[PDB]
Amino acid sequence: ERTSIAVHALMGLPTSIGLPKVDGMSFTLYRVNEIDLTTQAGWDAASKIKLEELYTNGHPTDKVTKVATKKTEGGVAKFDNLTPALYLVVQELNGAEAVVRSQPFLVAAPQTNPTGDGWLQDVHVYPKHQALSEPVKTAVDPDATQPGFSVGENVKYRVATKIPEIASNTKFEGFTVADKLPAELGKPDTNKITVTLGGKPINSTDVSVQTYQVGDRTVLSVQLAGATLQSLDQHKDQELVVEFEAPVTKQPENGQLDNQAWVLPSNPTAQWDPEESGDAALRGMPSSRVSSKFGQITIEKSFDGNTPGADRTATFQLHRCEADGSLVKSDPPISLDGKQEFVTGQDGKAVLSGIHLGTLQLESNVMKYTDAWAGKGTEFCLVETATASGYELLPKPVIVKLEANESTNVLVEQKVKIDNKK
């Protein structure tokens, strides 16, 4: 007689068949070798088993043999056409969403109907897991000398992760927060990476802060181990907060400087790329997205309607102005990649790149765009500081409209044609 094991992945704390079922939860079925439950030797052996003998350190031992691996659909993962045996069901870390997984457990097939009336060939089991909340990622300007984090300045990120309540008398296997920085960022400043749990620093021995390169991007990894990890289950609903700064080294080609972090309830031995995604991949819980919007101004200078050429040059500074076109009080020139003035080339062009305009991120739970230049006038403007011999300097700032908003998903550009006059 063929048997079946239907695995219903329940979300909740074991006190439970009324709990919600979850799709996309991944389980592997193993057969327990050399246990025949139809004999007294096999039955006595199976009441003797210690789970560590069958599965330990995140992996199946020689004592078991893999049958199949499957994801829940409609709340259930059904393993059909099974020969009678003792089975071990193992929830895996490669489900559709990251969860605090169920521990391995034994299932006999077939079983006696609990009523006594005959055999149950189709068995049902109800392992519980706990959900991970989506971490909240934000960006912060760490130095307010110039608004925002234009190319040549540092950005700071904050990743706030909630510690879930897990099953009574169980422990977290691990706890990693990983962030694959966008390519436009340099390596995080070692002295500015911080980690707190419920507002308190964590002792260094317990927290491993690592960076590693994957292609042209740096991954920052923070992993909890030691006593901190073993006691993490006592910090339910507290926040683990990771903050770091990194240099904005170039303008994103599409204007989008985008960051996400990922939480994994496991401490991989291999260097984990959280944005890897084949079926075998350890699935993290991704954070809320942060997108910072960049803009570029291109000046096209002429001198009496002609290309400037080899003996005609003008210089501009970028500023903020008020609604009436006048400079914001005490407005300093704006620095971009360490330049505070911009000289026109023989072709008349000057490019002001890597202007950070503002940031879209989650605020009190809703995606919100904030203008990085809020409160410093209303627009950008250019001041002409030098020109060619025989020409007049522009006496007023040149207003340049350059802004972003929550829908912005390409590089914001403005071309400014200026014809120096005689």
Annotated binding residues for Ca(2+), written as ranges, equal 141, 143, 146, 148, 153
Backbone angles phi and psi of 76, in degrees to 5: -125, 140
Residue 347 contact among Ca ion, Na ion, none, beta carbon within 5 to 8 Å by kind:
none
Cβ atoms within 10 Å of 125's Cβ, excluding its own: 18
419 counts as binding Ca ion under rule CB under 5 A: no
If the CB atoms of residues 172 and 294 are measured against Ca ion, the closer one turns out to be 294
**Among Na ion, Ca ion, none, what does residue 44 contact (CB within 5–8 Å per kind)?**
none
Contact 382, 416 (CB under 8 A): yes
Q: What does the chain come to in residues? A: 422
CB of 296 to Na ion, least distance (A): 23
Bridge partners of residue 85, in order along the sequence: 109
- Which among 220, 376, 346, 351 has a CA at the least distance from the CA of 294? 351
Q: Which does 288 bind (CB under 5 to 8 A by kind): Ca ion, Na ion, none?
A: none
387 is a site residue for Na ion (CB under 5 A): yes
Rounded Cα distance, 389 and 308, in Å: 12
How many other CB atoms are found less than 10 A from the CB of residue 254? 11
* CA–CA separation, 234 and 357 (whole Å): 42
**Residue 292 interacts with Na ion (CB under 5 A)?**
no
> Site for Na ion (CB under 5 A): how many residues?
3
Residue 141 interaction partner, one of Na ion, Ca ion, none, beta carbon < 5-8 Å per kind: Ca ion
With CB under 5 A as the contact rule, the residue among 34, 143, 237, 363 that binds Ca ion is 143
Q: Which stretch binds Ca ion (CB under 5 A): 68-76, 107-115, 144-152, 363-371?
A: 144-152
Q: How many CB atoms lie within 10 A of CB 347?
A: 11
Query: Does residue 13 contact residue 49 with C-beta atoms inside 8 Å?
Result: no
Residue 222 corresponds to which tokens in the numbers above? 């923070």
Q: Confirm or reject binding of residue 332 to Ca ion (CB under 5 A).
A: no
Q: CB nearer to Na ion: give 238 or 302.
A: 302
3-state SS record for 188-209: CCHHHCEEEECCEECCHHHEEE
In the complex, least distance from residue 396 CB atom to Na ion, rounded to whole angstroms: 12
Alpha-carbon distance 209 to 243, whole Å?
Answer: 12
Name which of Ca ion, Na ion, none residue 143 binds, using a CB cut-off of 5 to 8 Å depending on partner kind.
Ca ion
Closest CA to 150 of 297, 317, 336, 403: 336
**Cα–Cα distances in Å, from 83 out to 31, 47, 111, 305?**
10, 20, 13, 88
Nearer to Ca ion, 168 or 330 (CB): 330
Angle at 170 between CA 58 and CA 161, to 5 degrees: 85
Q: How far is CA 152 from the centre of its chain?
A: 24
Taking CB under 5 A as the rule, does residue 391 contact Na ion?
Answer: yes
Closer Cβ to Na ion, 171 or 421, answer by number? 421
Is residue 420 a contact residue for Na ion (CB under 5 A)? Answer: yes
Binding residues: 141, 143, 146, 148, 153
| Residue 391, contacted partner among Ca ion, Na ion, none, CB below 5-8 A by kind | Na ion
Nearer to Na ion, 105 or 391 (CB): 391
CB of 379 to Na ion, least distance (A): 21
Name which position in 97, 141, 173, 403 contacts Ca ion (CB under 5 A).
141
For residues 146 and 408, which CB has a smaller minimum distance to Ca ion in the complex? 146
Kindly compute the dihedral angle of the four CA atoms of residues 156, 174, 105, 59, in this order, to the nearest 10 degrees. 110
- Compare residues 151 and 314 and give the one whose CB is closer to Ca ion: 151
Would you say 145 or 407 has its CB closer to Ca ion?
145
Interactions with Ca ion, residue window 11-70 (CB under 5 A): none
Smallest distance from Ca ion to CB 340, Å: 14
Cα–Cα distance, 358 to 408 (Å, whole number): 10
Q: Which stretch binds Ca ion (CB under 5 A): 139-147, 159-167, 220-228, 384-392?
A: 139-147
Q: For the window 145-164, what string marks contact with Ca ion as x by the rule CB under 5 A?
A: -x------------------
**Which residues, 6+ apart, have CB-to-CB distance to 35 below 8 Å?**
42, 45, 46, 85, 86
Among Ca ion, Na ion, none, the one that 420 touches (CB under a kind-dependent 5 to 8 A) is Na ion
Please give the C-alpha separations between residue 308 and each of 76, 110, 300, 303, in angstroms, as whole numbers. 73, 89, 10, 6
List interacting residues with Ca ion (CB under 5 A). Answer: 141, 143, 146
List interacting residues with Na ion (CB under 5 A). Answer: 387, 391, 420
